[model samples]
Target: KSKLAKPIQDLIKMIFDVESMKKAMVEFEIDLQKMPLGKLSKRQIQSAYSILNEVQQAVSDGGSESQILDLSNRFYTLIPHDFGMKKPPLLSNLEYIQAKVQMLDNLLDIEVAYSLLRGGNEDGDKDPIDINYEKLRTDIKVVDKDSEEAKIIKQYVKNTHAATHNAYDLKVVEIFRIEREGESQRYKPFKQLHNRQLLWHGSRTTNFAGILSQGLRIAPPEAPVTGYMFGKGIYFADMVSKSANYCHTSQADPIGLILLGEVALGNMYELKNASHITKLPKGKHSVKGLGKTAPDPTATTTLDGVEVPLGNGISTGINDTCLLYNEYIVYDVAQVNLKYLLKLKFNYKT
Candidate 1:
């Protein structure tokens, strides 16, 4: 049987789904009526983060009860959250501060989607579908299931799926080769870097528009670095399931998407404990979180000169580490070259 091209329309619609964006906000307990998607602006988001920083400062310094309360009130005023006639939780602990910072990250992407949706093409002659595709700033092509590349990719997926978990399975629905504009030129300098590997990156479906448009990015300076395990860098995983968890899928919507990127992790600085890293140490290009299990080293292969760890999960005997699967983080955006985007259905066993 031959493959079809229109699966991309489904991909396009999934990313631009307005309802999904609203649902993401609702999940964060954001008051959409007060802070609608259209109302979100970069300056407003930045100011809200500044407020969070003030709240965190008060909490860190062990300020008086009234001082923390005052800062918390200001944050709530800036970014309205729905409490349903209940008292809003005070941002006096690290937990609340971290959660709010994560929310701002999502909000930033939501704003990007809205902004793109409104900034339509001035040339009325172009088809609407073409216009939408152009917004991504990335060329995505359907990959034939019978192709040699697809065979290697499928094998990679099968070998890595649920390397640790037995309760779920990932079923590939479709795959697309992605070429982000200007990425190759930007990444060209790092192409010859050593220890490069194909890695997985999963994000909520709501963020695809912004992700495809802008590529992977590090956390902004205004946000708290503590929000990230390795601090402010883009994170990746060697196991499919590890990254799939970031897709934020639920039983009601079991489908999600993941990216396979060629990460130029030249000299990895490995860690067993969390390090809020601001910069890599001498000669190190990336950070790796040591895990208890990783893809077996024996079956590793190369695709187009890029390493692919396709081996089944094997114990690494790292009992003291907090992570269960290896995590890779690159500080520079130019260090990643996204290769493929896969649509997968998370088959949860009852």
Candidate 2:
């Protein structure tokens, strides 16, 4: 029998499943016939971003109704979105602009995944899981259910999960400890930084392959600045469910994955409201978007010297803040060291 647990085996299968990645694109209403993953190019995506920028400029400049409509058509023509019988909505509103920006973000990851999946293995002697694992270039080990590490991680998920709605509850399924090749060596320079905490980051399952392969990246220069909140950095959350929202899951598919990372937040430039900041003021290494409620500081624990904010939810009593829970952002990729991956089942209300 394989030493790996059944859940771990299933996790491996889901993360590297090429079909699901393609399915995500299909759900995004991407015209796969025209813009197949294999045909995706960085330059083409850049051009798409440029069109989006033009649309943003047109809207903000209060250009003629026809001008906005014309630019919106240009974006759809270049990207080739599939609207079927429905007419494509104009990208003049804030909602449409942000939606298209996020689609480009997802496209970047889909490109990475398809690129890694390219090339054939003649003879095909190895297990499909083995081949997928080999391609990732990261060592993933299942944490024993009874171990201290797993216990703390489970606790982190439990205590920090504040359900704002009765519609769903997060149920932790399995945990994996990841060692991304060269990540530690790259993170060595930031080892001395203070305020290091183990925080949560969540994304769609399709993005994990790219995230594990290349690490989380900042937005591209071609992307409009309006696309980011607290501007263009690796965003994180102190509250589990806050980050969990990014998984973008639905009732049809309620499972999701989230990462617990060791982030080096040396000196935080705290903000109470949304600021489209392009750069941190000198001496500040990261930004903290303050919220009115946060995990209780008294219950904070540590793992390998990194703080784990597993404290129960408590009010910060700062009513003026813009967010309900805290968010952390780091400009440098090396400041984050991926630690654990948690598979969660969203028990949504019927």
Using all chains and alpha carbons, the TM-scores for the candidates as numbered come to 0.95, 0.94
Candidate 2: residue 221 Cα off by (Å): 0.8
Give model 2's clash tally: 0
How far out, in Å, is residue 325 in model 1?
1.1
Residues 1-350, candidate 1: write the lDDT tens digits. 11225898788878988999999999999999998889888888888888787777778788798988888888888888998999899998889789999889888888898799888758677765677888898999999989988888888888887645756888899999999999999999998899989999999998889889999898677877776789989999988879999899977899999999999999999999899899789999999999988988999999999999999888897899998899999999999999999999988888
lDDT (0-100) at residue 28 of candidate 1?
94
Model 2 residue 246 distance off true place after TM-score fit, in angstroms: 1.2
lDDT agreement with native, every candidate: 0.88, 0.86
* Candidate 2 lDDT, 128-233, residue by residue in tens: 6666667788888888989999999888888887758335788888888999999999999898999999999999998988899998888888888888888889
